[PDB]
Enzyme design. Structure first.
Site, short mmCIF file in Angstrom:
data_model
loop_
_atom_site.label_atom_id
_atom_site.label_comp_id
_atom_site.label_asym_id
_atom_site.label_seq_id
_atom_site.Cartn_x
_atom_site.Cartn_y
_atom_site.Cartn_z
N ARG E 77 2.36 -1.61 7.88
CA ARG E 77 1.15 -2.36 8.17
C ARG E 77 0.43 -2.83 6.93
O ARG E 77 -0.54 -3.57 7.04
CB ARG E 77 0.20 -1.52 9.02
CG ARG E 77 0.87 -0.90 10.21
CD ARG E 77 1.49 -1.90 11.17
NE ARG E 77 1.81 -1.24 12.44
CZ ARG E 77 2.20 -1.87 13.54
NH1 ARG E 77 2.33 -3.19 13.54
NH2 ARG E 77 2.46 -1.19 14.64
N1 LIG Z 1 -5.26 1.92 17.68
C1 LIG Z 1 -4.08 1.50 17.18
N2 LIG Z 1 -3.57 0.31 17.49
C2 LIG Z 1 -2.39 -0.10 16.99
N3 LIG Z 1 -1.65 0.63 16.16
C3 LIG Z 1 -2.05 1.85 15.77
C4 LIG Z 1 -3.32 2.37 16.27
N4 LIG Z 1 -3.49 3.58 15.75
C5 LIG Z 1 -2.41 3.82 14.97
N5 LIG Z 1 -1.56 2.80 14.99
C6 LIG Z 1 -0.31 2.75 14.24
O1 LIG Z 1 -0.03 4.05 13.76
C7 LIG Z 1 -0.08 4.11 12.34
C8 LIG Z 1 -0.91 5.32 11.96
O2 LIG Z 1 -1.78 4.99 10.90
P1 LIG Z 1 -2.83 6.05 10.34
O3 LIG Z 1 -4.00 6.06 11.24
O4 LIG Z 1 -2.99 5.73 8.88
O5 LIG Z 1 -2.05 7.43 10.52
P2 LIG Z 1 -2.63 8.87 10.12
O6 LIG Z 1 -2.94 9.45 11.46
O7 LIG Z 1 -1.49 9.56 9.44
O8 LIG Z 1 -3.82 8.64 9.25
C9 LIG Z 1 -0.70 2.82 11.87
O9 LIG Z 1 0.08 2.26 10.82
C10 LIG Z 1 -0.63 1.90 13.04
O10 LIG Z 1 0.46 1.02 12.82
#
Ligand SMILES: Nc1ncnc2c1ncn2[C@@H]1O[C@H](COP(=O)(O)OP(=O)(O)O)[C@@H](O)[C@H]1O
Ligand SMILES: Nc1ncnc2c1ncn2[C@@H]1O[C@H](COP(=O)(O)OP(=O)(O)OP(=O)(O)O)[C@@H](O)[C@H]1O
Ligand SMILES: [Mg+2]
Ligand SMILES: [Mg+2]
Lengths: 177, 365, 141, 277, 210, 70, 105, 52, 70, 52
Positions: E77
């Site tokens: 992303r």
């Molecule tokens: N609400 C959402 N909508 C779309 N994709 C999501 C969403 N939440 C997470 N993702 C996907 O899951 C991945 C988790 O990202 P992140 O939140 O950085 O993970 P972590 O929980 O390890 O911090 C993101 O790259 C995104 O692509």
């Protein structure tokens, strides 16, 4: 007068408008029927297709040249282009002929159609050939049938059917040619 | 007092208290940074007080991203207009040695504790991965000469985490609305570092890996997320009854999950195939597009008000939307937008057979 | 289904957020409701031992007890999460010594050791830091 | 703990054995009850060659039969027929008419008495308990001419192949009520046949439509029985592959918990020995 | 500190500011899983450090689909903002068509039955899958990748059978005149002047089979 | 209900509840006895369908709210 | 196994041949080194194997190679404990295997 | 498992063993009815999985 | 039978048993793979029912009372 | 579960090829001709590729 033409083509539109559009249209036994009655053909001369049927077995589906059937008004032969008929059958011997050689099945009842395209259809519930019947049992069964006559006329209807079938079977086993 | 976040599964099934500790439990890639950025986007704008972000052992890429997205949002102003800034960043990110990551949450807490006690303000304290506090103490306690406790953690896990977490409170003279991310170490909620911090939270929002593998975002487990605000004496009986009904339907679908696997849906009772279809609907209706997830998905964000969610989840429960398909509920804001997506799915199965688009006489244009 | 008795130790066991504290609280509130009715010696005096819980939850519980009038019969021993591990370890014994006064003087006591799964973790912290050899899940012998 | 996943593996493994046995039981039952289906297919076509196929008639009293199965691992067959039953039952009801709904097989009675309980007069089960015979279909057809309807819609699954089971509707018209009238065009289409029976044509057509109802009911339950076995043979195949994928996942989870258990018990032992050494 | 071991190593792969030269460092850590288990300790460590993932499935790899990229589980992303435009235009409908192709997974006529109205998305997702297959040691320039997936996803390979899309897309690359690759690389996007000449070039090529 | 035991059983509860609770404890055992046989829908002889509502009514009788003892 | 590697390494490095080396149960090599490192007082790694499992295996498996003078090819019987290919001893051994010959009953 | 069916004493009839369960010790008439009860109970324990 | 091995095997058994037991273990294996069908009502194709009754009488053949070797 | 008679002609051609392919994978070894009489074969790679 046929201003209300039911059919497989005319069920489809009322189905496509009323029934849900997820479903394909339900099939019909006409879709699995290759040969019919009114549309001509199927004779091509001296042959005609005979379909001799039981619920448990398909006894013949070949083409023949004459079949003699035990109608309620007596026996009658069906040549290549008979008149169209719906002949109820009584207990007797259905005899197929393809030429010089013949097979004789004794039937128990049923009907026999021949259609305006010359195809004939013999529709009986049980047809056992004359080799499969032993004559020592039909004599004793007719003796046990033509003896007890109950006043409940349902049972005398069954008794009349018994003595008709057994008598025609007994005359059908001394009638070897 | 309730804190409406505008997220459907958060508002309905585990509503957030306005001055309470909030945990987002997740398993490395399930979306607890995107959820905390959406809570900053939805909550910290409508909040009139100050915000603190404690980045404890997270990516420095995300720290620069939050800094730049806060400068262009106007929440952080540089130079002469710095007094109008509303947010304080404190960053102890995952390149730092373990003594720095084990004490940077206390720095963020001290900046928030000043605004609570001295300034009398209402503070928001976002902590990205309060787990890395525990992990950094676990790294330095292997060399402090202690006997290790269970899975490999320090023997002082609970008192360390408790002495940190008991400072994040609403006192009589100020409130800290703290949203903490918690990382579960191998998708293990029985690991001692998540299991210790479950006890210091008012609302836990447990994010699931399998829900994210379905594609349903945010991947909040509806039957593993809890709140002390899910109580009829605080949110009212009309919200509480539809939340408990949605949880009842989702559990009654979870009880059928292996029968549907080894036999199929073909043999279930027609009072239970209704349950399975309704739960497949209300677990797509917890899906929601985020305003911060629109950069990598393209679908725009949907803020849903609370009354919209309560009415939209009464409707799937009673049966007012049993004719709409399952995918009409996926990634939409309201129950209104289910209806404009359900029929748009039925234009586009009919727009296949309308025209034969050819482009003529443009070679001279 | 599972009726308690007057000198019986009944375990409330379950997973988190299933209503264990709730069953204990309804026991204390019901004892307030029945203490205002019985002649002076069937009255049950409650003690709530709140080990390892956060201080906000104990504040909510004291608020609930005092708004229902159940704090007249209830003692609350509160060794919260920020307290030292010997205080969380020792608070069930402190609470039991407070509630043993009613057992020893002809009255009737009732004690709830809420989160007794946290007294053992505080005891494990003390015993591992006193360098006693660990065992199952590094708990002491 | 690590014993529940072991006995769960054992349970899924024996369920996979059970469904792999049931798959080839249904394969044997489909392979023997296929020749009977092709033999009974002959007698239904002289009547539809004679009387024709008139599904969209306007009747005032009609008996609709849903031929279902008895055992309930058919995998999407009886639900398909109770879909098609009301899909054609609402198609031919726009005249303010009477309808009696009959089910052959008690999984039809478990599915039809909640969707049309106003119109459900008959439930016929135990039909496949040994075999279906023509006298059995004859008794069922006599129970159908206990009521005196103007038509008979018969819903069943035609055994097209071992994978395809086309749900069909077969229609039988009452003799004096619609059979002579749905043949009328420029006179009549049945007048080309010369009746060689005892009594008048109003009794020949009575006997013929009672025979035709019995014949299509015999073939209905026979075709539906063969398709019930052939769809159970595929549903049990999906059950073995599902309980094999589940076993292959749960064995990996067991191996992970096994390795984790040996590691954590050994770390407990080393931590207890390093405090003393 | 096995988390810190990898975190202090991967945090050094940065894109520096313009005051620091503007240099960058891209990292591709490689993590071998055991039986596809991505809930391992080190795997969940490095997943929570790196920005995206490239999941490679053993099921696809032993089905001939090489590179065996699990297209649902793999994300990136951060580099989605830094995509080649033109490839960004067609890759949206590429992964949306593959996304609704993954809804036809193991129940085409494997699972219960067939409806046979989604045969279009079935025989389209298959051609998008065998479009993305690629042999080893031969990396493709980006302007020839976006032309190949434009030919795949606009329907210009819709008549070709599934068995020779590998030959069809290399015939597309070799037969379409190499001016359009220079236009697409220099403009950096499929300009409105370019889709017309691209679609005029894509109808006049002989795709094998059929 | 199946897993929660009590050592004293009787002799330490209400006598009036002791009259009316043994027929609840055993009837819920009958209700749990048929829950692993409710995924098919055969509904044997109005017994495995009668207690399937009677015990389901008893488990609804045993529910109650919070902070409101009876 | 190192004695066998030495007798093969003579025929490789001196004679200049294509040598086979049959290590019967590389798992029992791993298991013996696990026992040795347990006797030297070392802390076991994952499930109970030596901490040096990868490098004790790589000390053997890296002398089996093709050099400029000859080669050593090696047909190693592999035992898989508890039918578990993700057990760290066959998971480590499979990282060095260049082929697989499965004999079935 | 026996006690969850309400059967008391909750003695597992299979998993219980004795040294006296020998036809030379308690008599062959006692031994055969004991082994027959265990035979029918093990057969029912194996049939429960196909019953469900 | 399926999990009991002897790596010495047939090289060290009775030569009169070796020519009879080689059939025995083979049809015991055949009986072990067709072991779910013993609990069925619908009889199969009598190449499996044959091995079912044969393997049943073979397992009842190998039973033996204690302290009475043969 | 069904039989070789209901198979397609190409679903019997793969059977007729695969049976002689798995027969053609067999080989008599030179180390077994001590006690099995049939002499052993050393097959080259060029013969193997063409013969398959
Ligand atoms: N609400 C959402 N909508 C779309 N994709 C999501 C969403 N939440 C997470 N993702 C996907 O899951 C991945 C988790 O990202 P992140 O939140 O950085 O993970 P972590 O929980 O390890 O911090 C993101 O790259 C995104 O692509
Ligand atoms: N009888 C009940 N009816 C409805 N809701 C209840 C009931 N009992 C408890 N709850 C709700 O369940 C939630 C958990 O209750 P409680 O705190 O008593 O459980 P707990 O196991 O003590 O949790 P923790 O382990 O977090 O302390 C509370 O929010 C409460 O509102
Ligand atoms: Mg993160
Ligand atoms: Mg509690």
């Amino acid at each position: 007068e046929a201003a209300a033409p039911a059919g497989p083509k005319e069920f489809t539109e009322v189905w496509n408008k009323k029934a849900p559009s997820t479903l394909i249209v339900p099939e019909f036994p006409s879709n699995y029927t290759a040969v019919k009655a009114v549309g001509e053909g199927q004779v091509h001369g001296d042959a005609f297709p005979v379909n001799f049927y039981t619920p448990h077995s398909i006894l013949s589906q070949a083409q023949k040249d004459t079949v003699v059937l035990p109608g309620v008004d007596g026996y009658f032969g069906v040549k290549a282009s008979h008149v169209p008929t719906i002949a109820q059958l009584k207990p007797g011997v259905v005899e197929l002929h393809s030429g010089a050689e013949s097979e004789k099945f004794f039937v128990s009842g049923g009907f026999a159609f021949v259609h305006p395209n010359g195809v004939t259809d013999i529709c009986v519930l049980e047809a056992a050939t004359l080799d499969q019947v032993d004559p020592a049992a039909v004599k004793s069964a007719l003796a046990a049938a033509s003896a007890a006559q109950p006043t409940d006329e349902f049972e005398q209807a069954a008794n009349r059917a018994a003595i008709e079938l057994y008598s025609a079977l007994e005359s059908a086993v001394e009638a070897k040619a | 007092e309730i804190l409406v976040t505008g997220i459907k599964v958060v508002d309905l099934l585990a509503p957030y208290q306005r001055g309470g500790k909030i945990g987002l439990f997740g398993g490395a890639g399930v979306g607890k940074t995107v959820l905390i950025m959406e809570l900053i986007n939805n909550v910290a704008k409508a909040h009139g007080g100050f915000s603190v972000f404690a980045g404890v052992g997270e990516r420095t890429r995300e720290g620069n991203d939050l800094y730049r997205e806060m400068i262009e949002s106007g929440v952080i102003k540089l130079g002469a207009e710095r007094g109008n800034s509303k947010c304080t960043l404190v960053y102890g990110q995952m390149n730092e040695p373990p003594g720095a990551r084990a004490r940077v949450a206390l720095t963020g807490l001290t900046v928030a504790e000043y605004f609570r006690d001295i300034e009398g303000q209402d503070v928001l304290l976002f902590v990205d991965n309060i787990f890395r506090f525990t992990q950094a103490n676990s790294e330095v306690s292997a060399l402090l000469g202690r006997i290790p406790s269970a899975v490999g953690y320090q023997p002082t896990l609970a008192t360390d985490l408790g002495g940190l977490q008991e400072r994040i409170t609403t006192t009589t003279k100020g409130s800290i609305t703290s949203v903490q991310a918690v990382y579960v170490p191998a998708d293990d909620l029985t690991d001692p570092a998540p299991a210790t911090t479950f006890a210091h939270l008012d609302a836990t929002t447990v994010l699931s890996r399998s829900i994210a593998e379905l594609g349903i975002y945010p991947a909040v487990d509806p039957l593993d997320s809890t709140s002390r605000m899910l109580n009829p004496n605080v949110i009212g009986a009309e919200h509480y009854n539809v939340a408990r009904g949605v949880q009842k339907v989702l559990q009654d679908y979870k009880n059928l999950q292996d029968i549907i696997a080894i036999l199929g849906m073909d043999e279930l009772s027609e009072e239970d195939k209704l349950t399975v279809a309704r739960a497949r609907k209300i677990q797509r209706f917890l899906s929601q597009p985020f305003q911060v997830a629109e950069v990598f998905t393209g679908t725009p964000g949907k803020y849903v008000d609370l009354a919209d969610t309560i009415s939209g989840f009464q409707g799937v429960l009673t049966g007012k939307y049993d004719d709409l398909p399952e995918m009409a509920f996926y990634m939409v804001g309201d129950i209104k937008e289910v209806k404009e997506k359900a029929d748009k799915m039925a234009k586009d199965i009919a727009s296949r057979k309308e025209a034969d688009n050819k482009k003529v006489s443009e070679e001279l244009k | 289904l599972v009726p308690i008795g007057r000198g019986q130790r009944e375990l409330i066991i379950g997973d988190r957020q299933t209503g264990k504290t709730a069953v204990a609280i309804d026991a204390i509130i019901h004892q307030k409701n029945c203490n205002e009715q019985v002649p002076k010696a069937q009255r049950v005096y409650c003690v709530y031992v709140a080990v390892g819980q956060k201080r906000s939850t104990v504040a909510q519980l004291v608020k609930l007890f005092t708004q229902t009038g159940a704090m007249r019969y209830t003692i609350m021993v509160s060794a919260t999460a920020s307290d030292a591990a010997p205080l969380q370890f020792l608070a069930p014994y402190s609470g039991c010594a407070m509630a043993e006064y009613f057992r020893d003087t002809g009255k009737h006591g009732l004690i709830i050791y809420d989160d007794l799964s946290k007294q053992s973790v505080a005891y494990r912290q003390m015993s591992l830091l006193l360098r006693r050899p660990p065992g199952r899940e590094a708990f002491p012998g | 703990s690590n014993q529940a996943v072991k006995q769960r593996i054992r349970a899924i493994k024996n369920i996979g054995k059970i469904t792999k046995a049931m798959k080839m039981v249904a394969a044997s039952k489909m392979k023997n009850a296929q020749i009977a289906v092709e033999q009974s297919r002959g007698l239904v076509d002289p009547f539809v060659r004679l009387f024709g196929d008139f599904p969209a008639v306007n009747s005032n009293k009609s008996v609709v039969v849903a031929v279902t199965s008895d055992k309930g691992l058919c995998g999407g067959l009886n639900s398909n027929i109770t879909k098609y039953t009301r899909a054609t039952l609402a198609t031919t009801e726009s005249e303010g008419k009477d309808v009696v709904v009959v089910s052959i097989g008690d999984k039809g009675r478990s599915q039809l008495t909640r969707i049309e309980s106003q119109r459900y007069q008959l439930a016929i089960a135990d039909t496949y308990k040994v075999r279906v015979t023509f006298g059995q279909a004859s008794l069922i057809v006599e129970e159908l001419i206990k009521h005196n309807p103007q038509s008979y819609q018969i819903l069943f699954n035609k055994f097209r192949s071992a994978i395809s089971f086309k749900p069909t509707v077969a229609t039988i018209l009452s003799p004096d009520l619609l059979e002579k009238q749905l043949e009328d065009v420029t006179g009549n289409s049945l007048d080309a046949y010369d009746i060689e029976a005892s009594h008048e044509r109003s009794d020949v057509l009575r006997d013929l439509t009672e025979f035709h109802l019995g014949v299509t009911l015999y073939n209905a339950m026979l075709e539906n029985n063969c398709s019930e076995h052939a769809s159970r043979m595929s549903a049990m195949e999906n059950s073995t592959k599902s309980a094999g994928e589940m076993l292959g996942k749960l064995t990996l989870d067991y191996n992970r918990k096994r390795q984790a258990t040996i590691t954590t018990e050994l770390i407990e032992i080393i931590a207890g020995a390093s405090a003393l050494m | 500190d096995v988390f810190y071991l990898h975190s202090r190593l991967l945090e050094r792969a940065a894109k520096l500011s313009k005051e620091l030269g503007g240099g960058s460092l891209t990292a591709f850590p490689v993590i071998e899983t055991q039986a596809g288990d991505v809930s391992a300790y080190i795997a969940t460590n490095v997943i929570s450090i790196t920005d995206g993932q490239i999941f490679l499935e053993t099921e696809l790899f032993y089905k001939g689909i090489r590179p065996a990229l699990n297209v649902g589980l793999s994300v990136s992303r951060v580099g989605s903002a830094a995509q080649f435009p033109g490839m960004k235009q067609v890759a949206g409908t590429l992964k949306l068509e593959l996304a609704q192709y993954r809804e036809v997974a193991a129940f085409a006529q494997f699972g219960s039955d067939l409806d046979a109205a989604t045969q279009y998305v079935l025989e389209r997702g298959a051609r998008l899958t065998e479009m993305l297959k690629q042999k080893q040691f031969a990396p493709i320039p980006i302007e020839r990748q976006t032309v190949a997936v434009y030919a795949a996803t606009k329907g210009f390979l819709d008549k070709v059978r599934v068995q020779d899309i590998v030959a069809a897309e290399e015939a597309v690359i070799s037969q379409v005149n190499p001016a359009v690759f220079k236009i697409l690389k220099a403009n950096g996007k499929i300009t409105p002047a370019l889709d017309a000449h691209l679609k005029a070039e894509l109808r006049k090529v002989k795709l094998p089979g059929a």
